[PDB]
């Protein structure tokens, strides 16, 4: 018997769902067919409307305190919650109802973890991360916009193998994936250490892969696995393809100034 997963969607862009299906090790196909039972998920599920709604009740009853609630996106508190409507009711009512009997709650991505783009100033919907709404349940944050595919399936794999939540840091992120800053093992680090920087896009320095700190790279303050695990079966990551890290796994990264403004106090890094 495979662990039921109820994957809800609030206000979101659906990047985390797309990232999940990019996983190569393990394949999303193998996760869905052989590891979990993905019983509710608006993206992929056959049933709609009343028939979809009926699944939630059925799984919650049969697997009370033995299903995982995965949340992509977040609930809005403005517009009486009706800036995100599910079944004619505010999303926040669905979130709270399904959270009630979950064994564990996964906050997929920056939206669920922190707020992401809709929570950037002035946050017209008062979009609010899951942990500020659901306060009486264990929540694992898997931030990033989206998180790396193998980080997402890695969290699932750990939880299914051990039936435990992995060790979390102070911010509720799994240490197995979020213990390193990008800047720790970034392959451009020798250039940083030698003061070798890009100053304008496509200058000679950019063509030699010099450090992107002066182009606004937020790797020195951003915790993720991008410099080692990398993206799409280790094909590249933002810095390898020539753009600085924009800090996308960090709380409130949209409101820490322009992405192209450099960090101050370079001597701290």
């Amino acid at each position: 018997p495979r662990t039921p997963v109820l994957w809800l969607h609030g206000l979101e862009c659906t990047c985390c769902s797309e990232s999940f299906i990019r996983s190569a090790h393990p394949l999303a196909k193998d996760v869905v067919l052989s590891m979990i039972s993905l019983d509710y998920d608006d993206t992929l599920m056959a049933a709609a409307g009343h028939q979809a709604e009926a699944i939630l009740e059925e799984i919650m009853t049969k697997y009370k305190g033995n299903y995982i609630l995965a949340v992509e996106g977040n609930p809005p508190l403005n517009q009486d919650g009706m800036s995100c409507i599910i079944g004619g009711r505010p999303f926040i009512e669905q979130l709270k109802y399904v959270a009630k009997d979950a064994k564990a709650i996964i906050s997929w991505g920056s939206c669920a973890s922190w707020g992401c783009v809709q929570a950037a100033k002035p946050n017209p919907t008062q979009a609010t991360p899951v942990h500020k709404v659901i306060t009486d349940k264990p929540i694992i944050k898997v931030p990033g916009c989206p998180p790396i595919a193998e980080v997402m399936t890695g969290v699932i794999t750990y939880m299914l193998t051990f039936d435990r939540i992995p060790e979390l840091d102070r911010q509720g992120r799994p240490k197995m994936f979020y213990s390193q800053r990008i800047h720790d093992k970034c392959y451009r680090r020798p250039h940083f250490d030698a003061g070798q920087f890009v100053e304008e896009w496509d200058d000679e320095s950019a063509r030699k892969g010099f450090c992107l700190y002066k182009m606004g790279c937020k790797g020195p303050t951003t915790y993720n696995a991008c410099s080692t695990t990398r993206w799409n079966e280790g094909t590249s990551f933002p810095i390898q393809s020539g753009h600085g890290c924009i800090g996308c796994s960090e709380d409130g990264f949209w409101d820490k100034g322009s992405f192209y403004d450099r960090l101050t106090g370079i001597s701290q890094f």
Binding site: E18, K29, A46, G81, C84, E200, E233, S241, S258
Partner: protein
């Protein structure tokens, strides 16, 4: 009850609610009324989400905008970033270098293929394919069907289909049906034989494994997928052949070419043949519903110029068609205040004057969540939405006041029209359509022992089948085009031009103190535009009009219906309590609700 655009709307019949609409991106509610015979006589499209990206952008740096608006959508990932950088570049008179153009085109076409193929198999197929019927299929006959549908596809053996089938059986026999749970399996709306169902589910699984390879093109040029990085002035992926130290060298380009070649094989051998075969069988069953506005009014901005910044060389040439007159394509100008306009008369927003539509340079986004007095239920518990008042988070875009359908089908009807008027750049899509019509009318029926039909493209294309076909054909065409773009990129680099970014106007001190620009993109789901006003180096106004905004729109000031609502009209339902037909037709537009509302 009232008449509009040749549709007789009537809300006196039985009311049916579908909320949530699943197998879409984002959040939608759909309501219909059906008559005494279960035919849809009214349809109501409600976008059930809003985030307010347009509001959030105010006061920010135009150079950062692409990253914010990219997060409008992770499904059509990057198309918003492309529109944004184009808009800012247009505002600031920035011309990007040839390599940046070509790399953006390759990225755009990669998205087209990935988006289209994943949509069809993973979101749409279950409206046509009965997975339980696939369990009853005979492996040998499935193999023989596969060989008729696509001879060149290597995965055709009886044992291969037997193994796939067995894993399905074990999955279903577990009692944990997962995404197939509570499905509409066995409904008479399903017409495929067991063997076609097994073939299709097999390709669903094949596409799921392969789709992750195609996006590695994005990863090379943009660092990651979803949400690859873009840049105002060009691309960040600097080029150095002589070299492992740069983002792009010849090895990285060879890798891209290998992925492109695989894409071409998939479109040609798996995706296009499946849609032709499934379309043929549903045509044979007489299921030609869902044409909606495609039979009259279609629009696209036009895309993929052979020569950069030269719109006459667009390989998907656009414009507007009205009244089903395919002999007259009107030019569409996104800068013209009298052309693209958005109404909010039936949307949850407010204007100073709601009897008019606003061009997006003058666009306004102030939320106004209020329900009409004939609503059944409350503000936080809606039972029946009141479509006579405001009923959606989606605005109502119109072109010179006309309601238009947008998307691959629109682009293919436009391409066909252009080709007939002597436009040579539309030759390939015309060839695809004629080839497809011959396969659907004649060749596939002959192969399967079915009677031949004689539908013209005029009769066949304006339908849910036609809309699905055009998406597949567009995927094929995009794969072909980026194959050519790749060759042009490598040729340009080898000729000595390694430039990837124009930084002349990177610094805001070089900008005019006031400016406006527009960026358009033929995004996977249709016509995308971003309109920007810049003041003192900051975003004064930023308005997006997105393809699903067009298609999913509620009624305008004149009460005219949008493409979704029109497409559901005049459609019989086998069972009013099973939304099979509603889903099939709605899904044929590939709705992206996060896109529609942003």
């Amino acid at each position: 009850a009232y008449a509009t655009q040749g549709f007789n709307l009537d809300d006196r019949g039985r009311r049916i609610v579908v909320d949530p609409v699943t197998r879409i991106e984002g959040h939608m509610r759909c309501e219909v009324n059906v008559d005494a015979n279960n035919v849809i006589r009214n349809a109501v499209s409600t976008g059930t989400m809003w985030r307010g990206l347009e509001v959030i952008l105010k006061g920010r740096d135009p150079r950062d905008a692409w990253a914010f608006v990219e997060r409008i959508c992770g499904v059509c990932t990057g198309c918003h970033a492309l529109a944004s950088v184009r808009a800012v570049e247009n505002a600031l008179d920035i011309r990007i270098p040839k390599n940046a153009h070509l790399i953006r085109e390759i990225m755009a076409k990669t998205l087209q293929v990935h988006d289209h193929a994943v949509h069809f198999y993973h979101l749409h197929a279950l409206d046509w394919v009965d997975v339980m019927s696939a369990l009853k299929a005979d492996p040998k006959r499935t193999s023989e069907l596969q060989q008729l549908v696509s001879p060149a596809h290597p995965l055709s053996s009886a044992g291969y289909f037997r193994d796939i089938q067995n894993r399905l059986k074990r999955f279903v026999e577990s009692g944990q049906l997962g995404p197939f749970m509570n499905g509409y399996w066995g409904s008479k709306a399903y017409v495929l034989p067991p063997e076609a169902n097994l073939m299709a589910v097999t390709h669903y699984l094949e596409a799921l494994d392969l789709q992750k390879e195609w996006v590695k093109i994005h990863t090379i040029f943009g660092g990651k997928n979803p949400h690859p990085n873009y840049l105002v002035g060009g691309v960040p992926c600097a080029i150095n052949l002589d070299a492992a130290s740069a983002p792009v060298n010849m090895e990285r380009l060879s890798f891209v070419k290998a992925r492109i070649d695989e894409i071409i094989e998939f479109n040609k051998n798996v995706y296009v043949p499946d849609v032709l075969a499934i379309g043929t069988l549903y045509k044979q069953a007489g299921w030609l519903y869902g044409g909606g506005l495609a039979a009259t009014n279609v629009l696209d901005y036009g895309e993929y110029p052979n020569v950069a910044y030269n719109k006459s060389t667009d390989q998907l040439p656009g414009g507007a068609i009205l009244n089903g007159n395919w002999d007259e394509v009107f030019p569409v100008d996104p800068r013209d205040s009298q052309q693209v306009q958005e109404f909010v008369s039936h949307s949850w927003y407010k204007y100073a004057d709601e009897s008019v539509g606003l061009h997006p340079w003058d666009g306004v986004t102030e939320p106004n969540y209020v329900l009409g007095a004939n609503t059944k239920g409350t503000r936080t518990r809606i039972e029946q939405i009141d479509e006579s008042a405001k009923y959606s988070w989606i605005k109502s875009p119109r072109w010179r006041g006309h309601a238009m359908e947008v998307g691959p089908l629109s682009r293919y009807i436009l391409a066909y029209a252009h080709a007939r008027s002597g436009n040579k750049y539309a030759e390939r899509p015309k060839e695809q359509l004629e080839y497809s019509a011959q396969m659907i009318n004649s060749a596939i029926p002959k192969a399967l022992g079915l009677p031949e039909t004689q539908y013209t493209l005029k009769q066949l294309l304006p339908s849910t089948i036609g809309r699905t076909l055009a998406r597949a054909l567009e995927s094929q065409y995009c794969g072909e085009m980026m194959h050519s773009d790749w060759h042009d990129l490598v040729a340009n680099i080898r000729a000595g031009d390694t430039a990837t970014a124009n930084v002349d106007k990177w610094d805001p001190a070089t900008w005019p103190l006031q400016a406006k620009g527009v960026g358009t993109v033929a995004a996977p789901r249709g016509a995308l535009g971003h309109w920007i006003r810049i003041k003192d180096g900051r975003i004064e106004n930023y308005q997006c009009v997105v393809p699903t905004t067009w298609n999913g729109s509620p009624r305008d000031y004149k009460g005219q219906i949008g493409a979704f609502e029109a497409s559901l009209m005049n459609t019989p339902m086998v069972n009013p309590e099973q939304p099979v037909e509603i889903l099939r037709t709605l899904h044929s537009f590939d709705p992206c609700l996060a896109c529609s509302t942003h």
